[PDB]
Q: What sequence folds into this?
RNA sequence: UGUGGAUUGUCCUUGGACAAUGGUAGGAGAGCGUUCUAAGGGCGUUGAAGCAUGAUCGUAAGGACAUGUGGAGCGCUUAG
RNA sequence: UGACCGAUAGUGAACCAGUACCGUGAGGGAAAGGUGAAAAGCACCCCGGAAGGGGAGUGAAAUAGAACCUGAAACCGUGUGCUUACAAGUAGUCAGAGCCCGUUAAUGGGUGAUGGCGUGCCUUUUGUAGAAUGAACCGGCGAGUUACGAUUUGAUGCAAGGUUAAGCAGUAAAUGUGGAGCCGUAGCGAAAGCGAGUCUGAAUAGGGCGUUUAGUAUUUGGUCGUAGACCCGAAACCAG
RNA sequence: GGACGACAUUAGACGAAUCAUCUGGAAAGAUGAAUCAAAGAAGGUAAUAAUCCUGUAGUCGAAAAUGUUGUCUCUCUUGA
């Protein structure tokens, strides 16, 4: 609108709450911090996890399992993300990354049958499951690894 | 949608170049954030004060801890002392942020449409002066009856249109690529060139 | 921007010193003592704003009890017989009539005397 | 700066929403009856997760 | 209890209601004023800001208007 | 150049500043801006030894005369309306004669012979009129802030998608361009692994966590993490 | 290791054109009519000045200086 009558969205901006500025505000003097103790001291308080002396929760439970850095992650793709183009052919990773249905291929492309293909297009990815191939076989595509 | 090209009264090839850029519904929530962020990056954080560990001196205890009958002090540059020592004062920082590209375009198209639905748009024909003549631009604006505040639009780098009509109270010059949401919301009328009238219809279309 | 205080702390301190006008000593000069005296005045006025409806009520009773013993009668008895004859009159009005037209009051006593 | 994780919570795996933990008493103590040793099932963390859910916050 | 008024939450779906309204540590909601910026429109040697006095106005923080002193700047509306 | 300060602020220092002053020495370290447009800075007369006054004169102004723009409180005085020497008092407040007034004009204002009721304020406490703590009075200054992260709520844009970083050509324009990356769309298991299911293990059986999918980018509020982290205050430790 | 210039930058250059009334101790104010503008940033002038000073936009740059060094030679050579 004008620069001398502009108004913001309703309930979009609010005023900040200032503590210690009177007794009518209801947050003065003590400023909602109690009376005494170690939680009312400037910059006081225990570490996030301290039990006050009792053994911490993450100290009684034992650890187990390694990490195995060398891990192969495959971009999971459903069967409902392949029915975007009718009468498709040769759905390679290069045509899938530029399709917008998949991006940043971690290390290959695995297909998982979650829905119905509802088409007879030729598939061609890295590897599939024991159902994906079956669905592709029913369609008529030459799924090659 | 049917605008009429003009040139000192004379009407030229009427151009109906106006679809989703002009005559659309403007947003009153995406136009407020576009103006609040426009003047937010036009601020310079050049303000600072000295704290308790910045004032000169104040390293020796004033008197004894107890046995004098006075308040227990620690330094001569404390915050409650007249010497100095601010607590939480201002500090050098920036006030500029960012917003989604989609919103940036919406707000830009939400301002031009408002100027087209308020009879404040005027698509004139290509114009060029041999030398920056402020008097020549004075009579030029006198013919095209408009408001005090205006905002001429340039196509590329009109040096004769930039140097001239720049020292006028209530007049601003800019290019199609340099179209903001503050200068367009500060003016009352718009004067874009026919050639630069379709250039903004493609970049914002 | 530094916002230094001024012309706002003395404008509110000059409004509490004007309310304490007529006090004895330094209770109308200093503001530290004026605020305390003005803070108690409001607590007193509100407390005696309900005690003013008890003093006047007791006053009328005393006046009606003295103007009822002249006709060999008692306030308790007079009132008892005045309510048995179905009469709705305030204690402030009864006393107002006794101080004025005595004849009227005299007749009223007889009406509440044969109603017993 | 960035916030740091508790590196000694190598004892919790993030489920979809919540966290799964390991069973204490799990070793070097086996003079036990056999109905007892056998229950080495998986339990999740309790609603003490309001004391320590900010410390494992990028385990995700 | 009688008579007039204030706020709520309800209710009915425009004012009669229905109920309700002690309060510390605390939680939630709606406001007043101070300094600076932007836009629009204003006031001022025919006397601005400040200061002094007054029997005035708003449910509170507060806001106007005359009069004296003073001799150059300062309000108002919307937002930050 | 500035949504930086404007003389207790900003440099310790706008002026006589590292100067008065303080210590054997290393060293510590203040207070203090403003007549007027132009000195035209009171010629002359009167009182006084002088200081300073009262006239006069200069000026728009002399209650602008170097204690020199404006001049607020505490504090100190002079005149004047009503009241006070038989009285027991957190000094007020409610009712109320008499004697004087006359406004922002309203069931107005000042003073107070008598009557009823009434043990200041802050902090800390099971509890304070307390003989528990703090303040002689007045004015000025003096305490939840910012940067980067995490989580939740409101608002808006797009939606199975959402969005950019450092950069580069620009009013130090913060709008274009920039697809390394980040979150989500699929989980389960110590892993290899399999996958709408998976691990369990002798068991597809019974169970555990999943499946019926709405998220994401920026901003607003609440709280938290790393920094001194709401403000002031120690005995003491180490280096030169 | 230095002759060779041209140019981006650091003093100084010239630097557009206002009168009249009113109130005033004095107007830049009000009011009325004008006129420059690659200069309507800012300060002074007996009050608030784009046209009374100081400048500013921009023009010579500058008796130079190097900074981008754009450029000829000069000793820089023998390698396959």
A:
């Amino acid at each position: 609108m004008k620069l001398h009558e502009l108004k913001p969205a309703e309930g979009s901006r609010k005023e900040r709450n200032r503590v210690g500025r009177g007794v009518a505000t209801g947050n003065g003097k003590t400023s909602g911090r109690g009376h005494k103790g170690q939680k009312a001291r400037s910059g006081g308080g225990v570490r996030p996890g301290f039990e006050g002396g009792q053994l911490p929760l993450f100290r009684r439970l034992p650890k187990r399992g390694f990490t195995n850095i060398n891990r192969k992650e495959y971009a999971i793709v459903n069967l409902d993300q392949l029915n975007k183009f009718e009468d498709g052919t040769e759905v390679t990773p290069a045509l899938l990354v530029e399709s917008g249905v998949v991006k940043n291929e971690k290390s290959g492309i695995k297909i998982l049958g979650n829905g119905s293909l509802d088409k007879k297009l030729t598939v061609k990815a890295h590897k599939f499951s024991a159902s994906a191939a079956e669905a592709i076989d029913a369609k008529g595509g030459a799924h090659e690894v | 949608n049917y605008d009429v090209l003009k040139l000192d009264g004379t009407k030229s090839g009427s151009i109906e170049l106006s679809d989703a850029v002009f005559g659309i519904e403007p947003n009153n929530s995406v136009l407020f954030e576009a103006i609040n962020l426009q003047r937010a990056s036009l601020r310079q954080g050049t303000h600072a004060v000295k704290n308790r560990s910045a004032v000169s001196g104040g390293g020796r205890k004033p008197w004894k801890q107890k046995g004098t009958g006075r308040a227990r002090q620690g330094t001569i540059r404390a915050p409650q002392w007249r010497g100095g020592g601010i607590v939480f004062g201002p500090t050098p920082r920036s006030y500029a942020y960012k917003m989604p590209k989609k919103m940036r375009r919406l707000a830009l198209r939400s301002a031009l449409s408002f100027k087209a639905q308020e009879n404040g748009l005027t698509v004139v024909d290509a114009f060029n002066f041999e030398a920056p003549k402020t008097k020549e631009f004075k009579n030029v604006l006198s013919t095209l009856e408009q408001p005090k505040k205006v905002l001429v639009v340039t196509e590329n780098e009109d040096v004769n249109v930039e140097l001239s009509a720049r020292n006028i109270p209530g007049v601003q010059v800019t290019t199609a690529q340099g179209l903001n949401v503050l200068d367009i919301t500060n003016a009352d009328s718009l004067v874009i060139t026919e050639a630069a009238a379709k250039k903004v219809e493609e970049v914002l279309g | 921007p530094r916002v230094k205080g001024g012309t706002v702390t003395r404008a509110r301190r000059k409004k509490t010193i004007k309310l304490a006008k007529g006090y004895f000593g330094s209770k109308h000069t200093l503001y530290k003592v004026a605020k305390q005296q003005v803070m108690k005045s409001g607590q007193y006025a509100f407390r005696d704003r309900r005690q003013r409806k008890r003093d006047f009520r007791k006053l009328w009773i005393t006046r009606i009890n003295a103007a009822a013993r002249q006709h060999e009668m008692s306030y308790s008895r007079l009132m008892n017989g005045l309510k048995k004859a179905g009469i709705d009159i305030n204690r402030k009005m009864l006393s107002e009539i006794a101080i004025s037209d005595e004849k009227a009051f005299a007749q009223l006593v007889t009406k509440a005397k044969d109603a017993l | 700066p960035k916030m740091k994780t508790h590196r000694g919570a190598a004892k919790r795996v993030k489920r979809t929403a919540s966290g799964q933990l390991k069973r204490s008493r799990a070793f070097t103590s086996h003079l036990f009856a056999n109905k007892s040793t056998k229950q080495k099932r998986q339990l999740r963390k309790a609603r003490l997760v309001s004391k320590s859910d900010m410390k494992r916050v990028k385990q995700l």
Notes: DSSP finds one helix and three strands in chain D.
